[model samples]
Target: MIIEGDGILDKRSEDAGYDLLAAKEIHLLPGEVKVIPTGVKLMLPKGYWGLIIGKSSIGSKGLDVLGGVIDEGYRGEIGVIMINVSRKSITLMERQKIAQLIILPCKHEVLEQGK
Candidate 1:
């Protein structure tokens, strides 16, 4: 179950995954970086993980999402690392769609177990 705070998954688009929004206003200068809150937390199903990706809307505006991973057991507020890759400053508004969250399955195998 996903608990919402100041952030919730935006369902207004037909994209690959859910679009995450900025929980609050974020100001970034050229080459500056910050972890903008997504205002959401959830326990991902076992064997699954979350991947953060850039939103096309902001990618062209000089905001580059640094990409992040969410473990299956993580239950803290989700945040996205963003950098002002361009020479100009960028300001992200509250509730603005900033990134996409893609939940993917993880495959693992244990080669050996020792008692």
Candidate 2:
């Protein structure tokens, strides 16, 4: 899987788990919330789903990468809601690790009213 973005950040802090892609970088002030844009669109196969999960280590550091579910038919740039809980400012640089995306298989069944 490839994430297409305008530019890339080569090196970031060593402990940063989520890399901010070239297109998606959100700056946050104390107690501020921002929605970061992810330029990559996804094409999910049938019977499968995409899950955006936050890295555990990052969460421990007063930053949260909210989890999101990418429906089977969704095709657009993924957006992330980032919140900074610490007292300092945070900068999400390009290509800096931001979050992890995981794809999983799902089973679905439709039910009718009198079945």
Candidate 3:
């Protein structure tokens, strides 16, 4: 119960996370982060969305992965912006381990309407 992650058995979901063929490389200068596109189209199930997080192993490289919440309505390629907090430039290669994605069900029920 300590670890929980949902992986959609769909094609796009599989394309995420170090899928090099679906990935393109990007470089970042110190203190700079760009929204690097993964070219993976997410088609989450109804009432479900995706969560984007960074790899903990690369934290010391000054790679700060800006977390992202992918909405169900979004049908575009997923992008993750990472910043280099270290003093040196970082060049990301194709299929580099960048992020981890998890599919989860969202709480969409509204018991009462807000004013």
lDDT head-to-head 1 vs 3, winner: 1
Q: Which pairs of residues collide in model 2?
A: 18-97, 18-98, 18-99, 19-96, 19-97, 19-98, 20-95, 20-96
Worst 10 residues of 2 by lDDT: 8-17
Alpha-carbon runs more than 4 Å astray in model 2: 1-24, 111-115
Task: Please report, as a residue range, the 10-residue window in candidate 1 with the lowest summed lDDT.
Answer: 6-15
Which digits, one per residue and each the tens of the lDDT, describe model 3 over residues 17-93? 43212166777888887887676766677787778877676665778888889888887777787788988888878
**Native-structure RMSD, model 3:** 7.1
| Per-model CA lDDT versus the true structure | 0.84, 0.66, 0.67
Model 1 pairs whose backbones collide: none
By lDDT rank, best first, the candidates go 1, 3, 2
**Candidate closer to the true structure by TM-score (higher is better), 1 or 3:** 1
lDDT of 1 by residue, 8-85 (tens): 564544556788889889899999989999889867788999899987889999888896998888888999999898
Q: Write the per-residue lDDT of candidate 2 for residues 1-115, one digit (tens) a residue.
A: 3334533233334542233342545678998977777676766678877676676656776888777787878877777677899999877775555666666889998988994
For candidate 2, the TM-score is 0.72
Best candidate (score: TM-score): 1
Prediction 3 global C-alpha lDDT: 0.67
Model 1 misplaced regions, further than 4 Å: 10-14, 111-115
Top lDDT hit:
1
